[PDB]
């Protein structure tokens, strides 16, 4: 399990979604991803998690209406095709090739800052992008009181990793208590299902020796 894979929950990290520790050990074989991609500002988020003491997961409770939320692949494989356990690959309807302009928001009711993570999908080609999330220019915005940033997918061919030439870009912000995060998106979104809270203090290391 990769230390960042605890946030997204790829199949390797199914047993580490809500761990709690004083000492966290990363191993050289840990991969944070199943569907190829990488975290923006990865090390800062790793440094945050190493001294986090653990992760508590609270459902964010997004409901989606009249789109496809079963996105899956045989790269993230648990039973058959699957995906990241904490997230959802939002596709378009089989009936209509449209992705409606959606607005989804979350309020952090808790006393600790919330680790919100999400992905932006870079399809292999515009053909692939239009087939999954519908035609037209795709746009994803993220906003809070502190944080604001907007994202547009960059379709194109990437080197094969686990059979896929596409890439998912994972982004994250930290909601302060009582603040609100809002997602506008009409496609190319990997929405969070659950948020993440830090359990305490700990120390992370990197090693390859017996415990």
């Amino acid at each position, epitope marked *: 399990c990769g230390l960042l894979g605890t946030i997204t929950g790829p199949p390797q990290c199914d047993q580490f979604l809500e761990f709690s520790a004083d000492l966290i050990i990363e191993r050289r074989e840990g991969s944070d991803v199943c569907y190829p991609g990488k975290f923006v500002n990865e090390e800062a988020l790793r440094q945050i998690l190493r001294e986090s003491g653990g992760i508590d997961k609270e459902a964010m409770g997004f409901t989606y209406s009249g789109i496809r939320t079963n996105g*899956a*692949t045989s790269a993230c494989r648990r039973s058959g095709s699957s995906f990241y356990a904490e997230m959802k690959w939002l596709l378009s309807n*089989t009936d209509n*090739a449209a992705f409606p302009q959606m607005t989804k928001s979350y309020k952090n009711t808790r006393k600790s800052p919330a680790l919100i993570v999400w992905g932006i999908h870079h399809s292999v080609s515009t053909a692939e992008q239009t087939k999954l999330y519908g035609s037209g220019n795709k746009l994803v915005t993220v906003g809070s009181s502190n944080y604001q940033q907007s994202f547009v997918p960059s379709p194109g061919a990437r080197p094969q990793v686990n059979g896929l030439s596409g890439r998912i870009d994972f982004h994250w912000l930290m909601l302060n208590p009582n603040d609100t995060v809002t997602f506008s998106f009409n496609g190319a979104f990997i929405a969070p299902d659950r948020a993440s809270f830090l359990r305490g203090k700990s120390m992370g290391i990197q090693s390859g020796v017996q415990v």
Partner: antibody, heavy 125, light 111 residues
Framework: EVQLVESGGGLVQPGGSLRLSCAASGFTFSSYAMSWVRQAPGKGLEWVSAISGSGGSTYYADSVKGRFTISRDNSKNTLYLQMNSLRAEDTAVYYC??????????????????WGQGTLVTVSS | NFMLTQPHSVSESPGKTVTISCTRSSGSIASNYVQWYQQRPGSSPTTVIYEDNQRPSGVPDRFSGSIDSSSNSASLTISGLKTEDEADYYCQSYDSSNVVFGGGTKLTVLG
């Protein structure tokens, strides 16, 4: 040059078995999923089953599920299809078709790009 | 799943231009990729279109792919027919784990 070749076609009394084997060459066989397509004598195409590059995931069509078992050996660059409890309906010509992806059965199927020459399996008493 | 519907018979004169349509019963046509295979009698099928419009290397530029989301149809189109284009043309598309084949279309060059 990619080339596929099927062998094992014959005549079988209904209720019998037959193990078809497609032979692959000219591409990296382990990294491309494979599939079996059949064509009744004078009818359209009908996809039968498919198997991933690794060989772990195996996907069958409804009409043949449970009676057909697909398998592969990545070392022998060979494909297989075990046909059991055969019927008159299953009499057709069977092609092995190289899939364009590594994985089969995920959200998007780009078709096939190469087709073996075919083999005739005939089932009648 | 769903079913695809092509005409059984299409005919035209050499050098003219045909279109073979393929209509999908359920689900949009632009929700997955469509192929076009061709089968000259006595030979295995070969693929003349993939991803709804793309020609494999070695397919004459007279073949084109198309997708009409209004009619929920995918349409092959052959310009300047030759005598060697006489074959059967199957369209193909995809669903959850299901591979749907069209009925087949007999393309005749009027002699």
């Amino acid at each position: 040059e990619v080339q596929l070749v099927e062998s094992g076609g014959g005549l079988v009394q209904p209720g019998g078995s037959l193990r078809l084997s497609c032979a692959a060459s000219g591409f990296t066989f382990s990294s491309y999923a494979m599939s079996w397509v059949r064509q009744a004598p004078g009818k359209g195409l009908e996809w039968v089953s498919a198997i991933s590059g690794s060989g772990g995931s195996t996907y069958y069509a409804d009409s043949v599920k449970g009676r057909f078992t697909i398998s592969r050996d990545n070392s022998k660059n060979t494909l297989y299809l075990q046909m059991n409890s055969l019927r008159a309906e299953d009499t057709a010509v069977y092609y092995c078709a190289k899939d364009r992806l590594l994985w089969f059965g995920e959200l998007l199927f780009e078709g096939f790009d190469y087709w073996g020459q075919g083999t005739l399996v005939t089932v009648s008493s | 799943n769903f079913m695809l519907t092509q005409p059984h018979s299409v005919s035209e004169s050499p050098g003219k231009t045909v279109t073979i349509s393929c209509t999908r019963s359920s689900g949009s046509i632009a929700s997955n990729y469509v192929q076009w295979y061709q089968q000259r009698p006595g030979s295995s099928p070969t693929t003349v279109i993939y991803e709804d419009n793309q020609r494999p290397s070695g397919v004459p530029d007279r073949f084109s792919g198309s997708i009409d989301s209004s009619s929920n149809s995918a349409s092959l189109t052959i310009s300047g027919l030759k005598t060697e284009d006489e074959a059967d043309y199957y369209c193909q598309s995809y669903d959850s784990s299901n591979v749907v084949f069209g009925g087949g279309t007999k393309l005749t060059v009027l002699g």
